[PDB]
Amino acid sequence: MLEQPYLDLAKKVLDEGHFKPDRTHTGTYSIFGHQMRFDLSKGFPLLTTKKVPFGLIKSELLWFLHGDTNIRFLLQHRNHIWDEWAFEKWVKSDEYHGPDMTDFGHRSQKDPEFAAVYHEEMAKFDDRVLHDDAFAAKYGDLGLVYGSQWRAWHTSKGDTIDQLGDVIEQIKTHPYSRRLIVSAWNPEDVPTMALPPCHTLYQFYVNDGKLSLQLYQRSADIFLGVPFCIASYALLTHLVAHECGLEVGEFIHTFGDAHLYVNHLDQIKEQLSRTPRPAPTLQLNPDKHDIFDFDMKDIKLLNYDPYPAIKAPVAV
Amino acid sequence: MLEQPYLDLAKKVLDEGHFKPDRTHTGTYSIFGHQMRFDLSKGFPLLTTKKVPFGLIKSELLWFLHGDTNIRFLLQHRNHIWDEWAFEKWVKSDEYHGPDMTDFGHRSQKDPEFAAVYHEEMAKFDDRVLHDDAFAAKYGDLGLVYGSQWRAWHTSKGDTIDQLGDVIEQIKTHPYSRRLIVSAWNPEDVPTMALPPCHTLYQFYVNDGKLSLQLYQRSADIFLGVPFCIASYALLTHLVAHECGLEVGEFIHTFGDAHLYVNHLDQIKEQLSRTPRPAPTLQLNPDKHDIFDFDMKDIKLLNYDPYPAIKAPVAV
Numbered sequence: 001m002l003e004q005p006y007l008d009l010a011k012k013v014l015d016e017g018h019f020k021p022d023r024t025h026t027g028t029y030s031i032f033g034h035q036m037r038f039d040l041s042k043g044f045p046l047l048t049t050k051k052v053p054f055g056l057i058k059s060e061l062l063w064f065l066h067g068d069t070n071i072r073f074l075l076q077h078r079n080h081i082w083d084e085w086a087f088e089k090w091v092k093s094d095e096y097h098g099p100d101m102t103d104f105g106h107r108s109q110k111d112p113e114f115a116a117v118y119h120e121e122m123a124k125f126d127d128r129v130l131h132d133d134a135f136a137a138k139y140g141d142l143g144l145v146y147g148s149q150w151r152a153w154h155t156s157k158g159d160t161i162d163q164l165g166d167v168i169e170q171i172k173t174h175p176y177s178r179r180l181i182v183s184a185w186n187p188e189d190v191p192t193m194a195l196p197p198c199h200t201l202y203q204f205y206v207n208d209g210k211l212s213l214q215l216y217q218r219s220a221d222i223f224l225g226v227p228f229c230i231a232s233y234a235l236l237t238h239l240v241a242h243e244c245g246l247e248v249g250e251f252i253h254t255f256g257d258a259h260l261y262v263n264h265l266d267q268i269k270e271q272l273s274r275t276p277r278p279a280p281t282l283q284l285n286p287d288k289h290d291i292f293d294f295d296m297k298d299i300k301l302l303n304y305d306p307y308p309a310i311k312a313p314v315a316v
Numbered sequence: 317m318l319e320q321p322y323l324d325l326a327k328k329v330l331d332e333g334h335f336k337p338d339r340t341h342t343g344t345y346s347i348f349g350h351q352m353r354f355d356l357s358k359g360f361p362l363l364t365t366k367k368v369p370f371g372l373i374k375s376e377l378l379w380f381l382h383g384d385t386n387i388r389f390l391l392q393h394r395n396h397i398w399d400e401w402a403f404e405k406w407v408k409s410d411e412y413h414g415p416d417m418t419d420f421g422h423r424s425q426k427d428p429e430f431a432a433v434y435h436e437e438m439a440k441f442d443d444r445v446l447h448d449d450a451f452a453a454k455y456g457d458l459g460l461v462y463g464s465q466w467r468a469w470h471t472s473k474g475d476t477i478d479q480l481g482d483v484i485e486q487i488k489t490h491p492y493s494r495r496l497i498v499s500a501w502n503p504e505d506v507p508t509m510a511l512p513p514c515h516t517l518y519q520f521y522v523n524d525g526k527l528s529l530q531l532y533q534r535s536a537d538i539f540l541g542v543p544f545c546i547a548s549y550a551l552l553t554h555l556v557a558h559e560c561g562l563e564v565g566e567f568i569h570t571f572g573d574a575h576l577y578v579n580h581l582d583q584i585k586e587q588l589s590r591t592p593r594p595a596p597t598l599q600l601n602p603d604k605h606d607i608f609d610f611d612m613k614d615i616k617l618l619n620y621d622p623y624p625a626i627k628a629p630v631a632v
């Protein structure tokens with residue numbers, strides 16, 4: 001079944017892991033080095049044994065492709081995945097006036113009185129960013145994010161480089177190129193980043209008329225992130241394969257440090273109780289092809305039939 | 317047996333490959349995405365079923381660690397692996413006076429009259445680089461090479477960054493860091509390089525008292541390069557594990573596009589006839605620890621017992 005590789009990753013990390021400490025202080029069972037392989041021609045790797053919001057995987061990807069960096073497009077789409085970043089910044093500015101929210105996303109999960117002041121100032125932020133133009137530009141832009149590392153890699157002679165736009169040229173004219181790589185890992189910026197890239201780099205490869213993509217993710221959360229990531233990329237593999245006029249091959253997911261947090265144990269353990277169902281089917285607008293200018297409407301997820309979503313706490 | 321993972325890579329590429337064209341025009345059987353895993357505590361992954369020159373894997377690595385880039389240290393050690401690069405450059409300079417050696421390393425393998433003029437001007441070059449200081453600096457420096465990408469990553473504010481020297485700091489003070497990565501893939505320089513890095517990036521990871529390293533090599537030659545590379549890195553894993561005071565774990569080799577050239581088929585096919593022998597054993601100078609200042613003498617390969625070396629032509 002499509003997703004078995006994924007469930008097998010979790011058993012392996014559970015009944016074969018190794019406990020180790022980490023940045024957030026919850027704890028983890030971890031393993032190092034792991035390849036997993038999905039055959040997109042067989043289906044779409046959106047988990048069935050747990051309900052994943054394609055809405056979120058979808059709007060975030062298109063944000064990326066525009067080479068955006070402002071949370072404002074996401075908010076525009078009710079997508080709040082990246083707020084806690086922009087916010088934190090806003091919070092540590094004296095233009096921020098009020099409740100010194102230090103470790104806001106820490107205590108808010110142990111103290112319900114704070115979970116209200118916090119979430120209040122958040123809708124302050126997100127509404128301001130939504131409405132005050134000068135704010136959206138000042139506090140809404142994140143800066144170095146996948147979109148800018150994909151389509152605006154800052155050089156040392158003052159210019160921007162469109163990495164993703166370029167590799168796509170090479171796929172048409174040199175489908176056999178073994179240098180078709182996009183990297184988001186930048187040495188000079190790496191030591192001044194809230195969170196240096198998890199999805200470090202990817203490489204496409206055109207087998208006989210088919211396009212494949214391999215990902216190297218240095219740090220993974222089997223439970224909360226891996227289910228999302230598998231789809232951002234299986235989606236990206238189609239989008240590109242669309243523009244270049246190629247059929248679709250495989251998605252090869254490779255991990256450095258793959259972890260399962262302590263307090264997620266009971267959930268993954270329950271999720272394994274389920275028996276996978278037939279995977280959905282990605283449908284794309286056959287009229288439009290210039291992927292950089294695709295829009296939500298242009299994608300369709302046919303036949304998705306998932307098990308209830310599983311409640312789980314962010315380990316922080 | 318230690319090296320089986322490697323031999324199994326070659327069978328897989330042979331009795332399960334896919335033919336595809338490429339840069340040099342020989343031809344290949346290829347596969348995409350592959351992880352292989354060696355347990356350095358069990359031995360040293362220098363192939364036994366074929367004789368590999370540890371002398372070469374060794375001097376090239378130390379060159380790297382010094383953050384050198386001049387072929388002059390290698391020549392100093394009879395190591396000629398990188399000459400054809402420096403040379404080519406020298407050749408396309410009008411200071412080069414004489415035999416316009418276009419595609420020298422092409423025709424020299426189909427025409428034995430040329431294989432003599434060529435190899436003559438080569439010893440011209442290598443002797444000049446060995447002796448004429450201003451030449452060694454002018455034509456002997458390669459520039460962007462593993463040594464400079466490891467220890468002098470050019471930033472956009474005029475400075476050099478010691479990537480490898482830094483990760484090593486982090487291993488001591490944050491052995492559990494999941495951001496311990498060195499990358500040699502640079503977007504802005506990539507489109508003006510004779511050969512952009514094969515060994516794209518590596519990441520260390522400290523499991524319970526043990527150090528592990530995973531490599532992402534975008535393009536491999538199962539026959540001629542993979543046997544060398546497995547050892548540069550298994551060697552590097554020990555060297556680092558030496559300085560940081562850690563035990564040694566595993567070497568995880570991950571490939572994007574792994575190929576076997578057409579005209580190498582008969583050789584690999586013969587090499588598989590052999591039955592692996594017990595692997596050698598790396599011994600390091602217990603007195604010295606500052607790896608950046610190690611020297612040949614400080615390494616010892618105990619108990620190596622290899623099958624005859626196998627003759628093979630460079631596909632070009």
Ligand SMILES: O=c1ccn([C@H]2C[C@H](O)[C@@H](COP(=O)(O)O)O2)c(=O)[nH]1
Nearest residue numbers: 023198219220221225226229494495
């Ligand atoms: O798409 C994503 C984003 C984040 N994370 C996780 C992985 C780790 O839990 C943490 C990053 O580890 P450090 O870099 O902070 O060590 O965020 C994912 O798994 N997938």
Ligand SMILES: O=c1ccn([C@H]2C[C@H](O)[C@@H](COP(=O)(O)O)O2)c(=O)[nH]1
Nearest residue numbers: 178179339514535536537541542545
């Ligand atoms: O350490 C090394 C150096 C080179 N190569 C090979 C791999 C390919 O044969 C060629 C590089 O492929 P392209 O980047 O040129 O497409 O050089 C190796 O396998 N290992």
